[PDB]
Nucleic acid binder design. Structure first.
Ligand SMILES: [K+]
Ligand SMILES: [K+]
Ligand SMILES: [K+]
Ligand SMILES: [K+]
Ligand SMILES: [K+]
Ligand SMILES: [Mg+2]
Ligand SMILES: [Mg+2]
Ligand SMILES: [Mg+2]
Ligand SMILES: [Mg+2]
Ligand SMILES: [Mg+2]
Ligand SMILES: [Mg+2]
Ligand SMILES: [Mg+2]
Ligand SMILES: [Mg+2]
Ligand SMILES: [Mg+2]
Ligand SMILES: [Mg+2]
Ligand SMILES: [Mg+2]
Ligand SMILES: [Mg+2]
Ligand SMILES: [Mg+2]
Ligand SMILES: [Mg+2]
Ligand SMILES: [Mg+2]
Ligand SMILES: [Mg+2]
Ligand SMILES: [Mg+2]
Ligand SMILES: [Mg+2]
Ligand SMILES: [Mg+2]
Ligand SMILES: [Mg+2]
Ligand SMILES: [Mg+2]
Ligand SMILES: [Mg+2]
Ligand SMILES: [Zn+2]
Lengths: 110, 55, 119, 118
RNA sequence: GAACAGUGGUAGGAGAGCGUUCUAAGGGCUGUGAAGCCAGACCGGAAGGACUGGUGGAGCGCUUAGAAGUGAGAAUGCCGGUAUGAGUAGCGAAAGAGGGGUGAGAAUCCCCUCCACCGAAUGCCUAAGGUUUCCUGAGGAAGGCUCGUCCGCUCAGGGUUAG
RNA sequence: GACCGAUAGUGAACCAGUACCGUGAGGGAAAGGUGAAAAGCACCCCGGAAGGGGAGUGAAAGAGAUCCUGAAACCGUGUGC
RNA sequence: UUAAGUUAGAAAGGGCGCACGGUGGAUGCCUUGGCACUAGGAGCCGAUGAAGGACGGGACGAACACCGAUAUGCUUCGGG
């Protein structure tokens, strides 16, 4: 049995979220929460909320036991990019990609 | 100086071999049992070295 | 050696004097860890003057302590507190009047924070 | 009537990329480089279907020489003797005997020696 | 059908074909699943063509002939998307520190204290110009080179008085 | 109509001579498609919200508004060699 | 046990294949709009104030469309 949660179009760059995901992928949900709580990165509180949302789903919707859950899938996909422009010297503008992420966690019983 | 050739996906991925985070230097809090950074006050319960700090 | 704390000599002196008086008044402050580590020596040396208690010691301290109220009830200055309350507390202790406890990084800039307090 | 490009373009290009499966990196992914590599693969395969015949004859000759010299003949002398004795067993077959039935190879070699000693 | 001979090729001449959209005439297919899309180890001398499964959810082949906006890999081609460089350069002259508060969240907002900077100005008034940016309350998606509970930003209300 | 079918056809299928650019004359875009019908997701759960997971509606929700199809580049997760 | 020899396996990460997604908006299908014409109409409006505008008008912000302080409409005659 699996429970999934997704955060779609979160304003954080995918590369930056994936640094943190790599810490928790395959870990037990107890450990993963700890890691996220003590990892000082912008992505940590966002990924913590998805992870906790997945556990809640596992308990509420599917009567899984939160003590026996493991992160079975964890990935970040590119959301749509907000395109912005930074003015540079000599009247030139240069693009800025304010990238967004779709953050998925799947928990499952061990 | 500009790149003479674009970097292949493979060379980009080899370069990122070491671009990673480490797991926190974490240990179980003897007071409350939550994980804490070793040698720091436990944020959860405010204990350090078997004494409450945030008193 | 000693730390520069990202500040010019004068700025660094101003900040260490500020923090020193803050810790005398409050007896516990939170700051960056590297500030706490610099502040220990500076504060413990003020307590040494306070423990001396003589007028020369008080005026040396007056060159460093800020002119701030340490107690609104009694109208006690930071310098008066140093030379009365703090000095009396540490009559028998020989050095090590402060301790640093580490807290972890603050949001905002990841700066490792710490509590420094009088023992 | 107007003819949009439509589907013919991607159908044609997809076929090239399918032939480029297993090529390295962009060569299995991007049409323009996959197409160059598939073309080049054609020239190579044509060339190599010819070379293959040269290469196997080279290999057989090497093995016949090794077996011949175990009977005290060089490849050159053996082939001379086999031609004089009228034996038309080819290099692919001689090399097969050399590996799989060396006693048979030695009979052919002994036949060759007979003609050379005349 | 046999024999004999031949079949490298740029410019270029000649021939035979493949495929695309539309039309006409036959004939058909399709909600029991059209086109398109994805996949496959099938077929043809090539261009190319099927078959099976998946997606798709309403249209489409085939034959013969006709007509063309009829085939792209290159034009420092045009438009769009997305890479690479790269978690790199940068984040735009400047003094803050702590305590308290607010809050889901605080280096960055509010208050307090001391400290610091301008002071023929970095103060006060007022043109031109701008045009609601002003005040109050609420807000935090975007804007703000970070953050944000804040804001010249969002939403509501309000506000300019002449012999 | 052996004319176009959203990069086409008008610059303009859409609040377009608009937005935007320029002191001005003037230049001048991008941007169509939920579903037969809103039946546009009551209620529960995590979350400040965004966003999700259920439950419902529907033929279909991987048709949920950034809503027919959904190629490629490009970005990921898993792993047979 | 010693000596000499031989050969595995390994993956920080990577390559190929496969599976499954994301992004993006090609393709197909569709048409609200165009393009080219044919037949017929009509080929002028204005000091009795035009063309084109500005500002206004609704129970209800802005905008469009419509209207003009008689303002989201008035009268009358026909239609329905
Ligand atoms: K199909
Ligand atoms: K090109
Ligand atoms: K001056
Ligand atoms: K506010
Ligand atoms: K256009
Ligand atoms: Mg300029
Ligand atoms: Mg100085
Ligand atoms: Mg084309
Ligand atoms: Mg020849
Ligand atoms: Mg068609
Ligand atoms: Mg053409
Ligand atoms: Mg191109
Ligand atoms: Mg770095
Ligand atoms: Mg950095
Ligand atoms: Mg570099
Ligand atoms: Mg550098
Ligand atoms: Mg730098
Ligand atoms: Mg600055
Ligand atoms: Mg204001
Ligand atoms: Mg920001
Ligand atoms: Mg057409
Ligand atoms: Mg389309
Ligand atoms: Mg157009
Ligand atoms: Mg203008
Ligand atoms: Mg689907
Ligand atoms: Mg339909
Ligand atoms: Mg779609
Ligand atoms: Zn604890």
């Amino acid at each position: 049995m699996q429970a999934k949660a997704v955060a779609r179009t979160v304003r954080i760059a995918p590369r930056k979220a994936r640094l943190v995901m790599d810490l928790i992928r395959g870990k037990q949900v107890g450990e993963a929460v700890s890691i996220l709580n003590l990892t000082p990165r912008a992505a940590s509180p966002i990924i913590e909320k998805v992870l906790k949302s997945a556990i809640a789903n596992a308990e509420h919707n599917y009567e899984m036991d939160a003590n026996n859950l493991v992160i079975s899938q964890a990935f970040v996909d590119e959301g749509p990019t907000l395109k912005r422009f930074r003015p540079r010297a000599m009247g030139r503008a240069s693009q800025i990609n304010k990238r967004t992420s779709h953050i998925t966690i799947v928990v499952s019983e061990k | 100086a500009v790149p003479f050739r674009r970097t292949s996906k493979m060379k980009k991925r080899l370069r990122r071999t070491h671009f990673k985070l480490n797991v926190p230097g974490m240990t179980e809090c003897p007071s409350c049992g939550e994980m804490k950074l070793s040698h720091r006050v436990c944020k959860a319960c405010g204990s350090y070295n078997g004494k409450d700090i945030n008193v | 050696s000693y730390r520069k704390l990202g500040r010019t000599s004068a700025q660094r002196k101003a900040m260490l004097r500020d923090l020193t008086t803050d810790l005398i008044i409050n007896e516990r402050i939170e700051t960056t860890e590297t500030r706490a580590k610099e502040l220990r020596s500076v504060v413990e040396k003020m307590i040494t003057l306070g423990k001396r208690g003589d007028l020369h010691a008080r005026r040396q301290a007056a060159a460093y302590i800020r002119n701030e109220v340490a107690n609104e009830e009694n109208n006690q200055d930071a310098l008066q507190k140093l030379f009365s309350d703090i000095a009396t507390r540490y009559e028998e202790r020989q050095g090590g009047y402060t301790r640093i406890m580490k807290l972890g990084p603050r949001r905002g800039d990841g700066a490792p924070m710490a509590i420094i307090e009088l023992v | 009537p107007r003819v949009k490009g439509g589907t013919v373009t991607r159908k044609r290009r997809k076929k090239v990329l399918k032939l480029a499966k297993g090529y390295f990196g962009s060569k299995h992914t991007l049409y323009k480089v996959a197409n160059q590599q598939v073309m080049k693969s054609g020239n190579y395969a044509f060339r190599d279907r010819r070379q293959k015949k040269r290469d196997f004859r080279k290999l057989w000759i090497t093995r016949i020489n090794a077996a011949a010299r175990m009977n005290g003949l060089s490849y050159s002398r053996l082939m001379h003797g086999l031609k004089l004795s009228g034996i038309e067993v080819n290099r692919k077959m001689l090399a097969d005997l050399a590996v799989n039935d060396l006693t048979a190879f030695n009979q052919l070699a002994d036949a060759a020696k007979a003609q050379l000693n005349k």
